[PDB]
Structure 1
């Protein structure tokens, strides 16, 4: 959508294939001077940047610590977990001892 986030797309940062739509209508040539008067709507990237909202880092519950390259959360605590534990009998000590 022209003027909206994600106006330009690409499967890869350098993929040859690209698609977009941002309301580019050409304008008639002006007086006596060769040029190309054009028109188009501002990038949705900058608009969304000005109003992207605050990062999730400052809004997640339970004090999540979030990192990008794994896109994971860490040291974020909530709930309970059952656990089953097997133990060698060697670690155990006879009572008389």
Structure 2
């Protein structure tokens, strides 16, 4: 998570995808319809930084 290659595809058009981004689900706010989640920020964008 949070590093280069956090998600990987064998080919740009491939149907496979290994993902490891520390995705977790938080409880929805009271009286709200949404799916809260918490993730490590993108490893590609951090690598570009």
TM-score under structure 1 length normalisation: 0.48
Deviation digits for residues 16-62 of structure 1 (CA, Å, limit 9, x no counterpart): 11111010010011111111111101111111111xxxxxxxxxxxx
Task: Report the Cα offset of residue 14 of structure 1.
Answer: 1.4
Give the TM-score normalised by the residue count of structure 2: 0.89
1:40 corresponds to: 39
Matches within 5 A, 1:62-73: none
Match of 2:2 in 1: 3
Q: What is the total number of aligned residue pairs between the two structures?
A: 49
The CA RMSD over aligned residues, in Å, is 0.8
Higher RCO (C-alpha under 8 Å, 6+ residues apart):
2
Structure 1 segments, 4+ long, off by >6 Å, are none
SS of the equivalent of 1:28 reads coil
Unaligned runs of 5+ residues in structure 2 are: none
Structure ID, larger Rg: 1
